[PDB]
Structure formats: C-alpha cells, structure tokens
Symmetry: D2
C-alpha cells in the first residue's frame, strides 16, 4: 500500500489464529515439537513469532528482503562485521558514531581486520582507498554528529564495480527519509533506539538485507552469535514503529524551524544541517532524502560556554541518544564521541564546543523559547 | 548470609528510594544529566538499574566480583572470546554445546583464533595442548550432552601455571551446584536460559569475573559490542533466580529417581549421569558438585527407535533447551548438536541414538509413569 | 507548555533520582517502610510511581486536579457510580455505549439506583427529568455510536443550578478535542482503550476530577474497590499518550476525507458525523470541539447488506473497539450494542443496518480504495 | 495428575499452534473477525488467551469449574458481592481483612446491602444470624490477622440447608493448603497478590466457582464491570503460580520453626498460629488444612514496643502484603487494619500491640537470628 499504511499493517502485524490486532509477546524460550524438524519454531533465540514480526516490518519498510533484530545497534553492527575474516580490509567513513569507531579500533582490528577512514563525499578518495583485500564500504549518512551527506547510489555503484559490499548506517534518516537498498546497497542497519522505537524506551538494532543469499548469512550469524532483540522489546519497537510517519513529520518540521531560528542567531557561529543551502551537501541531500532529518549540530562563538548553554535548557533535555519524542541535546566531545581521541576528533571535524541537538516533537514555540533560555545564559 | 537467603535478598533486590520489594523495570533508553559526566547512569546499553541488579545477583551467587548480563548465552560466549585477538590459541573441551562448537568453527576461526579440542578430564592431554600462543582454556562441566565431569581446580592450577585464562561454562550445574570461581577460575559464564531463569521463558547469558581488572575488560566489551540483556528480561531472570534453590533441589531429587529408574531398565543400554557410581567421573563429581545435576543422557538398545520413544512421551516435552520447570527431552544428533558434523559427533561420543533428558520439577511418580509410556511404545 | 509539549513532558514523565527519560515500571506489590506511616508509597494498589505518573498526565491534559487510572473504562465508570447510594436518581443520555447501558440495568439498579434516559441535546428534556432524589447527570458526547453532540457547558450550568454532579464520558473526543472540565463539569472519564492508548493494545480507564474534594472521593473508591490499572499497562497508556496529538490530527483529517467521500455515495442513505453541516448538532460541535472527531456512522440503502460490505473490506478491520491506529469497523446492533434490547435500540436511533467506522491513521488513499472494495461487493 | 504437576502443566500452559512453552502475552485490545459472532475472542476485557490461561489454572488447582482473574483481590471481592442487590443480607466473619471491612461499610451498605458480623467458629452464632433476607455467608480462614480457623464444610452445610451462598476467602491458605470447593462451597476467591503470585510483584485477584451456572454469573459481572487482570500481570501470576508448591513447603516449614522459636520466648505473651496445639482451632485446622499456613501473629509483653521490635529487623522487611518470598512483617493496627475503627478492632481481637509475620522462604537460621535482633532491641 502506501508507506503510512505499511507501518500500521505491514510486516506481520496481527495473529493469524486469534485475530489479535497485536503480535503476541512470545516469552517462551522453547517450543514443543510433534515430529522432529517439522516444527515451525524451535528456540526463541533462533526465532520466535514476536521478533519475527518486527523483523518482517523493518524489511518491508526498507524495501528489502529480510529483517534481523538485534539487542542494540552496536550488536547489529558487530555481527554484520562478523561476515568478514582476518585479512579483510574495510573502507569506513571519516565521521561515524564514536562507538562504531570504538568497535573497529578496540575489537575488530584484533580480528585481523584492517580499516581506512575516508570522507565518502569525495568519491575519488573512496575509489583510491580500494585495495585487493578490500571487501566492503561502511558509512553513515547523515553522519554522527556532523551530518555529512554521502551519495548513496554513487557509493553503491563503486561497490558493485569492485565486488565490494555496501553497508549504510541509516539510523539518522530512517526509512521515512532514506531507503538505501533502493539505491544499490546490500546491507542496511539501524540503531532502532533512535527514531524507529522513537519513544526513548528501547535499545535495539535492525539489519535489513536485499539479496536473499546475504539474508542467509546475516541470519546464520544472528543465531550463532545470539545478540538478538528480546520479545518484550521487539514488541515495543514494532509498537513505536507504527507512529514513525506521524512522529517523523513532526521532527522534520520542528527542525526546519530550529535551523532558521539558529541561523538568525549571531551567537551561533557554524551550523550542521543537511538542509542548509550554502552547505555543499545540500543537493545530494534533496536528491536522496525525503526531508532533511531532524538533527542539527551547531557551534557557539568561541568565548561562549556550551555546557552553560546546555545546562540551562529546561524543556530540551541533556542526555545521550537521539530520535526521541523529547528533544535531546548533547556535547559530542564530552559525551557520545569521547570514545574517539581528542586529536582524531579535532582532525575529523569535531571541536570541543560542538553541540548536537536531536530536534523532537514538542511544540515548536516551546522549543524556541527554551533555546532562548540557553542563549540568554551565555549573554546573547 | 546463607545461599538460600542470598537469592531472595542479594545482589540489588529492592529500590533504595521507594522501598519497592522489586527492582523497577527501567525501560528508559537514556538518562538526563544535571552536570555532564557526573550522572550515575547514562545510556541503557552501558548500564541501567534493572540489568545492574541482575548483574549484582549472579556475581554474589558465584562468589565473584562482577556480573555481566547478555542477550543470550551465545552472546555472552561471543563477547568473552572477544578478549582474544588473531594469533591466539585456545584449548577447548572435546564435548561442548554444539553452538559453542559452531561459534568457534564458523566465526572465531575467521578472526585468526586457533583451537584444539581436548578431553579435559585427561590433564596430560590438556597440558600437552598448551602452545606458546595459547591464551586460555575453555570447557564445560558437566558437558553438553554427555555430562563429562572435569576437574575444575585442576584445570585452574594448570591455567595459572602457564599464564592462561580459565573459562568454565557453568550452565548445567548452576551456582547452587558449582561455583567455579572458588576453585581458581578467572571467568564463569552461564546460559541463563537454563536453570537461572528456570521457567522456560527467558533467553539470556551471564558472565561473572573474579578479578576486578578482568571485570573492566568484560564490561568494556559488553558495552562496546552491546549484546546486552534487556530490562524486562533482566527483570525476569532475577525473578526466576529467586527460586533457584527450591527448584534445583526438586530437579536433583527427581533426577536421582530417574537414574535409578533408567538403570533398572534393560531397554537402556548406556547412561550418562555424574552420579552413576561405575562412571569414573563419579568421585571428582562428589568433590566439586553439590548434587549431581538434573541432566541424564541415555541410549536405548540398538534396534530401538529413540524418536518413537520420545514422540510418545506426554508429560515430558519434546523440545530443545533445558533447565526448565517442565522436563524437556531431546535427541542431540537431530537437534541441539546438529551443528556438529556427524563424523565429529560419533568421534566425540554422540551416537545418533542418544537421548538427553532435562529432569524437571513435576511429581516424580508422574514422570516415571510417563517414561514408561515411551518404553512401552518400543519394546519389539 | 503548549498542549503538544505537555504530552511529551507533562504529568510525571521521568524519574527524579536517575534521570530516566521514562517512568520505571514499578512491579513491586509492596514497599518497605523505615518508619510506619512516613513511607511515600505503601501498596501497589493504593498507588505506585508507575500508575501515579499516568494519573498525573491525564489530569494535566484534561485541565483537572487529579487523575485516576482503572483496569478498564467500564471499571472506571463502575467506581465513579459507586459515589451514589440506594435512593439516588441519575439522569443519563439516551445514546450511550451499550455497556454503560448494561452496567446500569444489570448492576446499578440492583443497588437501589434509579435512572431516566434523556436526549441531553434537548435541555428542557434534561431540566424536566430532575427529581428531588436526582444526584447527577451522566452523558457522552459524541455518543456511542450515533455521535449526538451535547452542549457540555449547558449541561454543566443545569447541574450546578440544582446541586447535581456532571459526568461526561470523553472517550470519543479525547482531551485533544474536548476538555469538559473547562466547561463546568465535575468528573471526566475515559475508556483509555480508545484514543489515549491509541495502539490497540491496552484496556484501561481514566477518571479526572476538577475539585480536590471529589478527587478525595474518587481516590478512596479507587483504592477500596481496587479496579486499578496495572503497572505495565499504565506504562503503555502513558507511552501511547505521548503521540496523541500526532495521531489525533491524522485521525481527524482522514475522517474529513471519509465523510466527504461517503456523502458522495448514493449507496449511503444516512451519515452520522459531528461535522456534517446539515446535522443540527453542527454548531455546538464547532463551538466546543477542536476537530469533529474521527468516528463516522452511516447507513446503506435498505436492500444493501452491511455484513457483506464489512466482510469485504481488507485494509479496514472488522472488530470491536475504536480509537486505534488501524481503522476498525463494526455493526453496533450485532456487536458493541447487542447488550441493548433490539426494541430499545430501534427506539433510540440504532437500526440493525447501522455501520460504525473508527477512522484510523493509514494513508487516506488506501482507505477510500478499500471502502470502494466494500461498496463494490453490494453493487454500488 | 498430581498437584505439583498441575502447577507446571495444568490450566492452559502452552500455545497450541506454535508449541510455545509459555502462554503468549496477548496485548491486543481487540481481535479481527472473519464472520461476525463466529470469532473465538473479540475484546481483551471480555477475555483473551493470556488471562484465559491463568483463569484455567486457578480453577483446576481449586477443584472448581471456572476461573476469573481480577485487577486486585479487592476488585474480585467487589464484583462477587455485585451478585447481591439492595435488600439482601450477608453474614460475614468477625475477623476479615480490613479492606473487606471497608468495602462493606463504605461501599456495599450504600447499595442497600445489610451485614452481620459473626465468629463463624461458633456455628450456632452463624445459624442464629440467618434472616429471611439473608443470601450468603462470607468468611476467611485463616482470618486476617488473627488466623481464626473456621470449619469450612460445616459452614457449607449450613449454607445449603438455607439456600445461601458460601464465599470463602482462601488467600492465606492457597489451594496447596485448602481447596474449599471440595467441602461444599460455591465461590472461592483469592488475593493473588499473596501466595499465588508469591514474588511480591503482582497485584491481582482470582475467583473460582464450582457450579457452571454461577460461573456464568461471575463471568457476566467480570466483563460488565471490567475490573479484569491485565495480560502482563495475568502472565506473571501464572508464572509465579508454577512454583507455588515449592515455595509453599518452604513457607510452611519455616513457619513451624518460627512458632516453636517464638513460643520459647517469654517476651512473647500471646501467639496466633493454626498449629498452636493449645489453640482450640488446632483440630479443625489439621482436618481441613494441608499444613498450618505460614502466617504467625504474636503479642509482646505490654511494656514492650512493637515498632521498636519491627524497625530493628533487617532481613525481615517492614511492609504491608504477605505471601511473598521475602518475610514481611507488620503491625495491623497501624497498617493493614487501620481501616477498622480502633474500638471495633479491640472489640474483635486486635490489640494495638499485635504483630503479624508473614513467614517467608529465606533460610530459617537467618530468620531466627534476625528476630533475635528485634528482641534484643526491646530486651527479652
Ligand atoms: C548512527 C548510530 N549507529 C549505531 C549506534 C549504536 O546503537 P545502540 O547500540 O546505542 O542502540 C548509534 C548510537 N547512538 C547514540 C549512542 C549513545 S552513546 C553510548 C554510551 N554513552 C557509550 O559510551 O558507549 C548516540 O549517538 O547518542 C548511532 O548513533
Ligand atoms: C552449556 C550451554 N552453553 C551455552 C548455551 C547457549 O545459550 P543460549 O544462547 O541458548 O541462551 C547453551 C544452549 N543450550 C540449549 C540450546 C538449544 S539449541 C539452539 C538452536 N536450536 C540452534 O540451532 O542454534 C540446549 O542445549 O538445549 C548451552 O547448553
Ligand atoms: C464511550 C465508551 N465508554 C466506555 C467504554 C468501556 O471502556 P472499556 O471497559 O472497553 O475499556 C467504551 C467501550 N467501547 C468499546 C467496547 C467494545 S464492546 C465490549 C464487549 N464486546 C462486551 O460485549 O462487553 C466499543 O464501543 O467498541 C466506550 O465506547
Ligand atoms: C485475605 C485478603 N483478601 C483480600 C485482600 C485484598 O487483596 P488485594 O486487593 O490487596 O490484592 C487482602 C489484602 N491483603 C494485604 C493488603 C495490604 S493493605 C491495602 C492498603 N494499605 C490500604 O490501605 O487499602 C494485607 O493484608 O497485607 C487480604 O489479606
């Protein structure tokens, strides 16, 4: 049907036998069998009706073939990279969530995997990074937290041309804004803690594969490694997913309003927003994004203290995470990207004074009034 | 106090501010902060009051220093082995759960990790397997499904003598029967889907470390990889853990009764039970095990069909998993150990006719009557 | 705060001690006490942090003083009417949900309570029904299922003039559309199974009182009778409430589109919609309702079979309940109002061919296309 | 089967279609229908697979025909008494839980219902209370908190002889100790917050009827009044019920040990325990009770302060409720029976210095050591 209708009714969204208008929460760890092998489900880790349904939904939403729900976005990333073996080289984006940076440096390189960081907006930089042992290209768009917009279909074509895998981290856009499998990508993955759960009460990850033979691989790993999303929280994700469209419009609209508002502040010295029209990413954003996202990062004038600004907001809420109905705000150097050494941070674009604002769903008037409370506290 | 009292009151078992006689279920993904860094909790993946409490409990029960709860026992094993890097060699037990076999062969060896299988009851075999790149010894006791009893304190001393790590998979015994950290081991890990949840409605894993510096390492990995146990199911584990003592006595007692009963059957050609007194493992079992477990594996006479036997039980329940209040039964070649190639299975002790019976909690009379229903369905 | 911001942040919407961006689920039945009496909470039935927060929220949303959450809307109605004693007379609306009819006839009249049904759009009819033993006026607007719009502030003034209580059942409008406490009413009550939970996975009721001395009375009854809303489902209500504004706009807009669409069908012989402009209720609706609701009832031409029409819809879903993201549809004579005798039904406006359509949130195009599938099946 | 096996496998304890070893949690509020009326379930309040299964279990356990799960024990009592109408007279026990006293005085007498309190151990007192408008006999055994043991089969025969209903509140014994439907009673009801949930994290009530025509009546009221037990907490009850036998033995045994221990204290001036052999209730207790319960009430010497005693226990926990794995303790005049006026309390047996101890499951040694801490603080 149309996309709004797929949220309500797509995936598996009911119970065949009873008519229940809500996938039951199958807490059972195991399932009895009449004949061996013939049983439809066998063990809750290998798969169960509750997580099966959330998996179904994220996949129809992403225009892919198979969904896979994981305990966290980190856990999803980890078993996706478990496709690769020692010797393999991966090209990564120069700006990714600090944890993806951490999992690579602190774990994956232990496993014989090598990495090269690349501004994947420069395709020649990407093309130049491809070695005979290179096996994949991993990137986010928009990036955490600078919101660099990368050309998905471009990177996908590069990947196919060289028998590489394309892995896009679609957390910030969500399928309402971007469906990377529709631009040639092989694997799409989400931190469903953000916009797909949307209510600030679920940690989880999602992977959606387009080919069926890579669904086999990601599934075999999901079950062999077991970092699965549990029944209650699979059920909550799917519950929060049903409002994704309604929530995401409210986010996008509010963020338009916050950007025009921050641009009109001289206290604000730089702004990161894919809808900034002097931003060179502006056109690739329009082309591949239905909306410009609801994340804005910005810098204050160098003498101005961002912690003062942030600790004096009162409707906006100082915390990590993003994609929540509540507008969260954060200083990535002191929080989500402290896992990256300060020298690499400043080298890749993340000054110590950067502020990252997950625009939320509250009434726009109350948000601007609140941001004013924070500008007022640093004398502006 | 005493162990039964630690189940009810140990770990964190209440709520400091309210008095609540039950750790609240902290579904929040993130936590607001008044001043950056100084917040007690930050992000539900990194840790939250609900999972923190289950973590506390499994650790006081295991006589260790730190607990870590994971999405599944598999997920716990995976991030424990993420301590190791390419080049490292691990000695493993010749009989481990087929999934541990699978994670090793299908994933871990991709990461440059090498393995040697060893009957860790033969300490000279173990001693002989130790190479200059060997870094750890991983084993279960009792083993899945043959219930080989290994000398924990012996393997621990071997490990310390060679600057190795000892990793014991304590799923079948549980802390009520065995506390391997008390015999010199560094890491203890559980499939909490079995006896610790005990109710057949939770998938989860637990790791407990004894040193504090290895708790730091396992924690850093728990958070960086993210295969964490979610709040609802952390809460259910801890709920099921409170009855572990009551349930485990009932299991052990029933299993004593099932063994004497199966031994008196000529249809039963071989039996695997750590309390079998002609079993050479019998004495190391008495020495290090408070009870003999509630798992029995057995073989029928070669012309007798184990699937007929199993598909004709009606109180006992044909399914995977174990440690449940309900007595589960299973054929490991056709089920939990199908992940091991048939030739390696027969080579390591697992005939195609082996039956594995998780003795449960139902009334012993009803169980023997039921097992009779299955013997009746095969004689000739 | 503006209303959209109160959904996200109003009531109690976080956890004071931790910062948790989600009221924890306090499953504890009881709370320890250091000193007797001086404990803040005491017993989960009497009140707990989880249900306390949902109670807080429905009350700030309704512009009242106290919230009270119940196990179901029926259970809320029952303990509200438990204010009254034998001898008391209540005026009720001629069109109320069949269960309110049932609770009155089958239970409340057993208790010595007397009732008079009255079209509360005719204020003289209401005024004329007031006897010396009359103690309250109970009504819904819009009514289930004919959507008769009653003048709330008019009925409120009548009530105060005669030392009566005004009880309005605000289920169909919800606080986004109507806030009856702002028009002079004493008690507002909800079937939170409808729009406040909004996700078709919560049964519950809410009562909000404006005076503080009637909050005392409703509270004393909530605890003495105990028909309370449990912690998990209190938590889900409040979770579903956060999107009420986003969801309710989508509902209202879709319903505008469905009405214009049904009006342009000659197969449709009569329509019940508070926004029908030839409907005499149209102006009192504009005056007291922010939107016209998202319920439409309609009749087909007398030879046309409504069960054929309904059993041939495929995006719309044949079931009881309403207020769900999914568009539910139903035949009140054969379903929600079978509890009213057929003769009283036809007498009060409910023909056997009436159809009631809870307009939902799915894309409007897919809904009209679907309703066409049902018109096509009866030949029009 | 045997009773221990019915806890694990009785009622509905699995899922027919999947084999799930755990009744799924059917959060759906409503159920789709293919043809009207034909649907097995239709609205979660009227009944759903999750609560249906808990209802099934409490009924097979109680040797009755129909189970009914309610939001709280209070809510169960309230809709059971909703069978009666104005004019009806009920005989009640002189010692019932203070809330049952409150619901009667503060609500039920409003409805034209009249009550007579009677020591139902004296059958002539009961016989003498029966008026032409008397319709039922309501009592608890053991009573809250004095644990008066009443002759169930005697009261049942009295009831049938006079076309009365017998309603026994079986909360303190639980079906493991007493099954009143087996002694001639019509209605059995439980506060499942106590021993049936057993884990101190569920509020709920249960009613079990023996005749099928009274199951119809209690059901019609359950649905019309709606004070139902919600899906998550229905699921938790049934989860806690599976260990009832294991937990209840531990309770009973510990309580034997606590009584002998308290009897040997001269600081303890009076003791209430159905197993006290100088207690005249001792023999009717042996005859109708499998065990003597795990509640002990006792008085200290008149100069000794019970709040000092209680506020100085540290394994035992000062709170309301009972039946929990943790040993709770309480002063009924200052807590659970403050709802009864002090003069009626002292008149019926409840001095201001009475202590009520819900013996729990913790190790007996740790409990006696703890009670010593409280005797030490007042000096024995
Ligand atoms: C694009 C992307 N992909 C993947 C992920 C990971 O997904 P999750 O495992 O959290 O669900 C994220 C996470 N994002 C959160 C993480 C908070 S920091 C974690 C903790 N403080 C720590 O120090 O480790 C954020 O930027 O605010 C992500 O933005
Ligand atoms: C000693 C030990 N350590 C660890 C684990 C893993 O713990 P979990 O991740 O399951 O919680 C187990 C598991 N045991 C279950 C697994 C069922 S098979 C899985 C599935 N059919 C598949 O084909 O993969 C069993 O033997 O019955 C284990 O016995
Ligand atoms: C304005 C109003 N107030 C109160 C309520 C009651 O609230 P709840 O207890 O359901 O949450 C409702 C209910 N409405 C549902 C009830 C379904 S019928 C019940 C069952 N089939 C039965 O035969 O009894 C409906 O019309 O579709 C209500 O519309
Ligand atoms: C034999 C019996 N039947 C029924 C019930 C009622 O069952 P529930 O509704 O609690 O589940 C009970 C309750 N018993 C608890 C109630 C705590 S007091 C309530 C509150 N403090 C208030 O002041 O009101 C107790 O004695 O400790 C009961 O002992």
């Amino acid at each position: 049907m149309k996309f709004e209708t797929q949220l309500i009714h797509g995936g598996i969204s009911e119970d065949a036998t009873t008519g229940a208008t809500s996938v039951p929460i199958y807490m059972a760890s195991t399932f009895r069998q009449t004949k061996i092998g013939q049983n439809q489900y066998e063990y809750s880790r290998t798969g169960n009706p509750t997580r099966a349904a959330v998996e179904a939904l994220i996949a129809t939403l992403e225009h892919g073939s198979a969904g896979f729900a994981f305990a966290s976005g980190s856990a999803a990333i980890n078993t996706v990279f478990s496709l690769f073996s020692a010797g393999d080289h991966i090209i990564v984006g120069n700006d990714v969530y600090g944890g993806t940076f951490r999992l690579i440096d602190a774990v994956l390189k232990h496993f014989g995997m090598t990495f090269t960081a690349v501004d994947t907006r420069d395709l020649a930089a990407v093309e130049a990074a491809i070695t005979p042992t290179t096996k994949a290209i991993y990137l986010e768009t928009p990036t955490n937290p600078l919101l660099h917009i990368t050309d998905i279909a471009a990177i996908a074509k590069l990947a196919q041309a060289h028998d590489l895998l394309s892995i896009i981290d679609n957390t910030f856009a969500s399928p309402y804004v971007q469906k990377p499998l529709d631009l040639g990508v092989d694997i799409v993955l989400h931190s469903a803690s953000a916009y797909l759960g949307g209510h600030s009460d679920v940690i989880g990850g999602l992977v959606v594969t387009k080919t069926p033979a890579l669904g086999e691989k990601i599934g075999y790993l999901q079950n062999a490694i077991g970092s699965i999303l549990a029944p209650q929280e699979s059920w909550l994700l799917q519950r929060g997913m049903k409002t994704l469209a309604l929530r995401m419009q409210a986010h996008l609209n509010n963020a338009a309003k916050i950007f025009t508002y921050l641009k009109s502040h001289p206290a604000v010295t730089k702004i990161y927003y894919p809808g900034d029209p002097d931003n060179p990413d502006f056109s690739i954003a329009k082309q591949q994004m239905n909306g410009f996202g609801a994340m804005i990062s910005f810098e204050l004038q160098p003498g101005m203290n961002p912690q003062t600004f942030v600790e004096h907001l009162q409707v906006i809420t100082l915390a990590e995470s993003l994609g929540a109905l509540e507008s969260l705000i954060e200083i990535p150097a002191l929080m989500t990207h402290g896992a990256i050494p300060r020298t690499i941070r400043l080298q890749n674009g993340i000054k110590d004074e950067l502020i990252r604002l997950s625009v939320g769903v509250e009434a726009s008037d109350d948000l601007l009034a609140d941001l004013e409370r924070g500008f007022a506290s640093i004398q502006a």
